[PDB]
Amino acid sequence: SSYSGPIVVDPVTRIEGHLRIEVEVENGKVKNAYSSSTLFRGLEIILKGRDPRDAQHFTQRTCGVCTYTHALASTRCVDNAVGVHIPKNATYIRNLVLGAQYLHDHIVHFYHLHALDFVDVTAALKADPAKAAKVASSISPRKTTAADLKAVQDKLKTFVETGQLGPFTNAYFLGGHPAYYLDPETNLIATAHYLEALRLQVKAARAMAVFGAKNPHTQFTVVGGVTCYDALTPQRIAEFEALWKETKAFVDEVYIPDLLVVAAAYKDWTQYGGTDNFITFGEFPKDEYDLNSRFFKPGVVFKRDFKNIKPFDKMQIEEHVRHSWYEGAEARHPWKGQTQPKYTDLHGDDRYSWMKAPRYMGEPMETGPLAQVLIAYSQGHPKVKAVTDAVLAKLGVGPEALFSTLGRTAARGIETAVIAEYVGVMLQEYKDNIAKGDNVICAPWEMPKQAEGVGFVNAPRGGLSHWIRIEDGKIGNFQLVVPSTWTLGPRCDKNKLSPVEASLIGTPVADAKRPVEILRTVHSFDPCIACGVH
């Protein structure tokens, strides 16, 4: 019973945006893969000729999952082009909203996007809630009782008995599936926490609105700093702090224990989904013009050589189009970027995606939590080292296990835990600065007629860069190079498979009609196709 032939997954659900995955499988294992992004909007085309101050409002609509991140990148980019050094408090406030974005985003990813690849929600109905409560209480300082879990089981039983399965309709686990391994009790714990996370994420997102106006799509950044004078008040800081503390408690007592329990049950997933090269830009600066002042530092690693981390040279980025639906075949550095759509249909002239293919010194680079965590570890980051070692010790695996779909999923939790604690450190520094009498949040600036600028964000999915050429005081060129473009773009003009495509080779597929193993690896990268294509 092992399949040879093609599999297509279109739509890939439980991602942001519109992705088609194609694989060739030989004897039950994937032998070849294509990452095809099937929506184009053309925001770079739309920006031409406009006021550079308007860019962040357009580019934030690249994506509402990773909301704020593109407003921050465009504002850093135009700040950089005009040469303004924003006030200390603007850096603190921008950093605090970004930290809150990471917690919201990664909690929703693990429960609401990834977990249905590994949790059979309907098997939770078979569970013994008393046993389940014992297990939940053994993995977390939070005590869970049988009645807590029975309430969830009773709600789910009414739901399933209605015959209206809603978002669970035709799930790959219905009826049982050989690649779903959890016992009923663990499925009930995860299901309970899925539901809990639906309400907790409201609070995690509200934390961004306390300073940033609203979520989704914040509205508090300007060239030169931020606008939110109310963010200086003790009442708004207390409101943020209480939402942060409750979100952190959920990360530490709910998400990370669940991640570890699921990881332990799926330890064979240390064998699939590895990649070779990693790039990260660093995040949470003390100095807006020095990436090495960031809490996480930038770095480049090739062929898993973490003993030789290379500096990040922004001039070594080129975006390929040979296998993409754009004119021609010439790769471009983004300050010389081109966005010239030309559709040839699937595999026409060997083109199969609306994403460009970014390459660093000609290589395909994974970015995102696994790159941020592994490079920061390798740089001696003491918080990352402490959490990552504890995770490895708890799972009983060595460091090599991180180079996998399981490891990538674990790294997303590691980064969430480390950022959740660092948000408290930033908050205290911000409080201390206000107490010194610094109440400034925006600095004045002047628009140059000609300039180049770049802004760097390490977003929840990895290294984000926005690149502007100002001509006559207007946008002459504006190029976004986004984390999912790195990770999920197609092949380049050297025919190198992208990180997601290479990571799929070797994936076993138990049931070609229900190819959850492909989803596990694809979802571990947390794809965002609106991001990748814009």
Binding site: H18, I46, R50, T62, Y172, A213, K214, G224, L346, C442
Partner: protein, 267 residues
Amino acid sequence: LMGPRRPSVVYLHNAECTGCSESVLRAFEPYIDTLILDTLSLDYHETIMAAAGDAAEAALEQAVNSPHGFIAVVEGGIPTAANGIYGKVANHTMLDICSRILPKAQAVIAYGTCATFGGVQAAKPNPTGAKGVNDALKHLGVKAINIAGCPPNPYNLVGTIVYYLKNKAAPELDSLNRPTMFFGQTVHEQCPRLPHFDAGEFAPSFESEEARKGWCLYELGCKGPVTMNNCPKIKFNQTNWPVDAGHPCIGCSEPDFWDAMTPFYQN
């Protein structure tokens, strides 16, 4: 995926950023778990549904052809240039998908300025020929209730659906097909800075002491006077809205706002 009991919702994603989907996850009293388990049956939604690929397509077919009927909620503009090829799902263009499904719905809600009016990808020069739902599908007689904003207040989506389920009809709509109960007032007439506007007290810059003191943002570009929405009343996330965060309104619930309201920092 549904049957009798809870009303069936089919949620479609066209040319969109998923910010409108995220806004619905911020639903408060009722929260999204109540909405998905008790109020409604969410029978297709690519962001959160378990099924993928062929199984997801079969889930869609089963929902759309159900004898109990369904309500469609649509996020994103429809790309119409080059015969719709700039957006496809399951290798069908979004224009074809929406042309086949939306005329079968009992009611259609276009949720977000992209679905209502075309949105960010329809800004000049509109390379993909993106259109709002009613514009793109006029010829098929589709008349979606438009709940505008980028993204809208999720209070306004739930309130519209509750009204429809109670009354089996749309609420009163304005000339842009938006509910008057949410879009009947300008942002400005509800704004706490209105007394400063009246006194001609405007912040000249974001770094100014006038901005610190909460003076009106009109000279810094605020579009509150030309924008219909309930932001100052309901707020977002139960806590804030753009002008109370010291930033001007950019007009995001109005048609073509990307071109009509720019430059965002000028009036």
